[PDB]
Amino acid sequence: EKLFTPLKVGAVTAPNRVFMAPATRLRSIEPGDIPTPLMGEYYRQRASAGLIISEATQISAQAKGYAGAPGLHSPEQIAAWKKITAGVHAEDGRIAVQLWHTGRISHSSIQPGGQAPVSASALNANTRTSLRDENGNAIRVDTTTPRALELDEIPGIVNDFRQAVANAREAGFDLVELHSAHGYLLHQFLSPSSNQRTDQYGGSVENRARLVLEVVDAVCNEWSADRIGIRVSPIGTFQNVDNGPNEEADALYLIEELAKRGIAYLHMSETDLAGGKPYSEAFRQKVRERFHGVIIGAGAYTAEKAEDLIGKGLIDAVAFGRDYIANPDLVARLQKKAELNPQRPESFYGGGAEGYTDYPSL
Numbered sequence: 001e002k003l004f005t006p007l008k009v010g011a012v013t014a015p016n017r018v019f020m021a022p023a024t025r026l027r028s029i030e031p032g033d034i035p036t037p038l039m040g041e042y043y044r045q046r047a048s049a050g051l052i053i054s055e056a057t058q059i060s061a062q063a064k065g066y067a068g069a070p071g072l073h074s075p076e077q078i079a080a081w082k083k084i085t086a087g088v089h090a091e092d093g094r095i096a097v098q099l100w101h102t103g104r105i106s107h108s109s110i111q112p113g114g115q116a117p118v119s120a121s122a123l124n125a126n127t128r129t130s131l132r133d134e135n136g137n138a139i140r141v142d143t144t145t146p147r148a149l150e151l152d153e154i155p156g157i158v159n160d161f162r163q164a165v166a167n168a169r170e171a172g173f174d175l176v177e178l179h180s181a182h183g184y185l186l187h188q189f190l191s192p193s194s195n196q197r198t199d200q201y202g203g204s205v206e207n208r209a210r211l212v213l214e215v216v217d218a219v220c221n222e223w224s225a226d227r228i229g230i231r232v233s234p235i236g237t238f239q240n241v242d243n244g245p246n247e248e249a250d251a252l253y254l255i256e257e258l259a260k261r262g263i264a265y266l267h268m269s270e271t272d273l274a275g276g277k278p279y280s281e282a283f284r285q286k287v288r289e290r291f292h293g294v295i296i297g298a299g300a301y302t303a304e305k306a307e308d309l310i311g312k313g314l315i316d317a318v319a320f321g322r323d324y325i326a327n328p329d330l331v332a333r334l335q336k337k338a339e340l341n342p343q344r345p346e347s348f349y350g351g352g353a354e355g356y357t358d359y360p361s362l
């Protein structure tokens, strides 16, 4: 078995390969998009993970697309996240913050000034996001048509990611994960289906990857490359954002470019929750030979699949989403081959302690 053996992940060392995947739970305080003591308890319960990757966290107010998702831009947010990271560290854990801009997967009612969200192009995502009703309960609402970012606004986006990483360092996170997956802003630029720009940020793969690579360079300069990871979902379709007709070639281009920066990790979200075609071993080899840090796989993994691919040398760690939602001590359960708690997906999004901090440890 290798799942329970240590792994150096940039500037930190994980004691096992069983990582907690990022999971939006939509329990922050509004107004202010502030993490809570209940969220600190949730993460503290999971601190035996080789690495915790937090729920997606806004880099700015404009980045917000879901009511209840936290930010890392305000002083009050920074102060609250400092308590959460302290709690994880008190339990000898490690925690990374996943940073996002939702782009067009958003709604005007939670944007600054009530105005349209932004994206690469002015095309509706044709999906829903999650708002809150007058009693604070999560509700699904159609996304608002976005405005295309003007060329002169793109430096501000890069600066927002830079500043959020600086804030993550102060807040005590061990690493950052850039959310370049799942149809959110960075992926909106990457994908030909959502990016119809005719400037240097659209067209060719080199132009479509331009923004994400500018963000990577900015955050590496702000902190250090050994503190930066990135989540990608480059094969398949995710929240109506496909990866285009040359998805494999384009993914390998992006990975080769990320490798030049010497970042800590590459986290690949292999399928969305509705499924998709599995990665071939050949494609995993092509990824492996292009990236020289840690590769994290995710998407309906079992311990068996993780051990298989780690032992084949194709990935270094596995991130579990829903199993970690329901099992705070997943590491111990997997080590002892114990049963897992049953999942309650009706409480994944919104609400309070129920379905959040009340899944028992062994």
Ligand SMILES: Cc1cc2nc3c(=O)[nH]c(=O)nc-3n(C[C@H](O)[C@H](O)[C@H](O)COP(=O)(O)O)c2cc1C
Pocket (backbone or CB within 6 Å): 021, 022, 023, 024, 025, 054, 055, 056, 098, 179, 181, 182, 231, 269, 273, 298, 299, 300, 301, 319, 320, 321, 322, 323, 348, 349
């Ligand atoms: C309730 C829920 C919230 C999620 N939120 C995020 C998120 O904030 N960021 C992200 O990159 N993926 C998110 N995901 C995807 C998970 O990280 C993970 O890739 C996915 O659950 C598939 O893995 P699993 O079969 O182990 O659950 C979420 C999934 C679920 C079920």
